[PDB]
Ligand binder design. Structure first.
Ligand SMILES: *[C@@H]1O[C@H](CO)[C@@H](O[C@@H]2O[C@H](CO)[C@@H](O)[C@H](O)[C@H]2NC(C)=O)[C@H](O)[C@H]1NC(C)=O
Ligand SMILES: *[C@@H]1O[C@H](CO)[C@@H](O[C@@H]2O[C@H](CO)[C@@H](O)[C@H](O)[C@H]2NC(C)=O)[C@H](O)[C@H]1NC(C)=O
Lengths: 45, 49
C-alpha cells in the first residue's frame, strides 16, 4: 500500500500514474452500507 | 560516468555487483545503478521530480 513510499509512481521519462479519487476504504463503506440496508429493510431502502 | 551520460540524483546503495560488472539495468531497460571507477562503491540513481 502507498503509505510510506515517497510518491515514486513516475518513471524516468514523462510517465505518471494518478491515484483514484475514491480510496478503497470509501468503497468498502459503500458496500457495507448497501449490504446492511438490504439485510434490514429489504427493497424499500 | 565513464562515457555514459545521464541526469538524476545519486544515493549510496548496498547492492551486490559482481567484480567484473560495471553498472545495472531495470525492467524498463534503463540505468538504475552504477559503480564509480574511483572507490568501487555501488551508487543508486533516482529520477528528477
Ligand atoms: C517527503 O519527504 C520527507 C523527508 O523528510 C518525509 O518526511 C518523513 O516523515 C515521516 C513521518 O512524518 C518520518 O518518519 C520520516 O523520518 C521523514 N523523513 C525523514 C528523511 O526524516 C515525508 O514523509 C515525505 N512526504 C511524502 C508525501 O512522501
Ligand atoms: C584511484 O583513485 C585515487 C587517486 O589518487 C587513489 O585512491 C585513494 O588514494 C588515496 C591516496 O592518495 C588513499 O588514501 C585512498 O584510500 C584511496 N582510495 C581507495 C578507495 O583506495 C588510487 O590511486 C586509486 N584508487 C583505487 C581504489 O583504485
Amino acid at each position: 500500500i502507498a503509505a510510506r513510499d515517497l510518491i515514486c509512481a513516475q518513471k524516468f521519462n514523462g510517465l505518471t500514474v494518478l491515484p483514484p479519487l475514491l480510496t478503497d476504504e470509501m468503497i468498502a463503506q459503500y458496500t457495507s452500507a448497501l449490504l446492511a440496508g438490504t439485510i434490514t429493510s429489504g427493497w424499500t431502502f | 560516468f565513464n562515457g555514459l551520460t545521464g541526469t538524476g540524483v545519486l544515493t549510496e546503495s548496498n547492492k551486490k555487483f559482481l567484480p567484473f560488472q560495471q553498472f545495472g539495468r531495470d525492467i524498463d531497460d534503463t540505468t538504475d545503478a552504477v559503480r564509480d571507477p574511483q572507490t568501487l562503491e555501488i551508487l543508486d540513481i533516482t529520477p528528477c521530480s
